[PDB]
């Protein structure tokens, strides 16, 4: 298969990973001053949704870094496992997590479309329609938490609002039922 | 056969060997400061993959120098063995190592394509499809180690990280199970 198209794809993935990380950092700083505005100005719940979007983004940041490590370590053993024909256990975790998150990351990046195709084009043993679904069970559970879509515990969203109000110097009063939870 | 096309090919091989050696040296210095950055900044494992790529490159550097010696010594006896019709034992090691590494070096250089063709065009005794495969068994095992694709022992990758942290003055703590291994 097109393994150097795959490789330069990965390189662009890494480049855009860095770029998007940086851009989202920038706008996240602006948005944190903005959240200081919303919290300072009335609807802390509006700021609560804003910071929900932000903590979502931060889950994405952490997941981005984890998978950046994964694509880079897979890139290390390009020719080596390319000599092989099945995936090894040393890369089974990375491959499983990547295969699992790839559909979640299909939209975020178009290179990864080809990266996943070439992955599945690379293997059939524990690879394919369901065989790939069988081998993908070794996905990183930590990334899974960093890729879980949920409301954080309102004690923690309150703590994010508290540490924001700390860092950004607004008055925040958590809901004591949740501030105790 | 085209033995002076072969010869100027070899000359370009040597020229680009020097050039690529120099360029990879330059960017390797930049990449070593960069590895000092990654090690200094968080993911030492990211730096670990980076320095895995680098130590791979250094295996390539050493292999490059070895084969540079080989092509130059073969160049010394151009007309002499050209008078002969089979390869001699004095060049059997160099020829075997070159024939063996040439497919690994097919991609790195396009001149060597012709150099290998003209090599096989030079000989049939222990030369050809499998006869060349038979005579290539005298490849340099040291270069073979410098052309082996493997993970170095993690005590040694830790030692490379330790001597980098020494030279580049970052804090590195090897995995004591591997730092003892």
Swiss-Prot record, chains A, B:
The keyword Heme does not apply. GO terms for cellular component: azurophil granule lumen; centrosome; chromatin; cytosol; endoplasmic reticulum-Golgi intermediate compartment; extracellular exosome; extracellular region; Flemming body. Residues 1-163 are annotated as: Interaction with CHMP1A and CHMP1B. GO terms for molecular function: cadherin binding; identical protein binding; MIT domain binding; protein domain specific binding; protein-containing complex binding. Keywords: Cell cycle, Cell division, Cytoplasm, Cytoplasmic vesicle, Cytoskeleton, Nucleus, Phosphoprotein. One of its GO terms (biological process) is protein transport. Its main location: cytoplasm. It is found in: Cytoplasmic vesicle; Cytoplasm, Cytoskeleton, Microtubule organizing center, Centrosome; Midbody; Nucleus envelope. Signal peptide: none annotated. The modification Phosphotyrosine is found at residue 38. ESCRT-III-like protein involved in cytokinesis, nuclear envelope reassembly and endosomal tubulation. Is required for efficient abscission during cytokinesis. Involved in recruiting VPS4A and/or VPS4B to the midbody of dividing cells. During late anaphase, involved in nuclear envelope reassembly and mitotic spindle disassembly together with the ESCRT-III complex: IST1 acts by mediating the recruitment of SPAST to the nuclear membrane, leading to microtubule severing. Recruited to the reforming nuclear envelope (NE) during anaphase by LEMD2. Belongs to the IST1 family. Interacts with CHMP1A, CHMP1B, VPS4A and VTA1. Interacts with SPAST, STAMBP, and USP8. May interact with VPS37B. May associate with the ESCRT-I complex. Interacts with MITD1, in competition with VSP4. Interacts with SPART (via MIT domain); leading to the recruitment of SPART to midbodies. Interacts with SPAST. This is IST1 homolog. It comes from Homo sapiens. The gene is IST1. The chain holds residues 6 to 186 of 364 of the full protein.
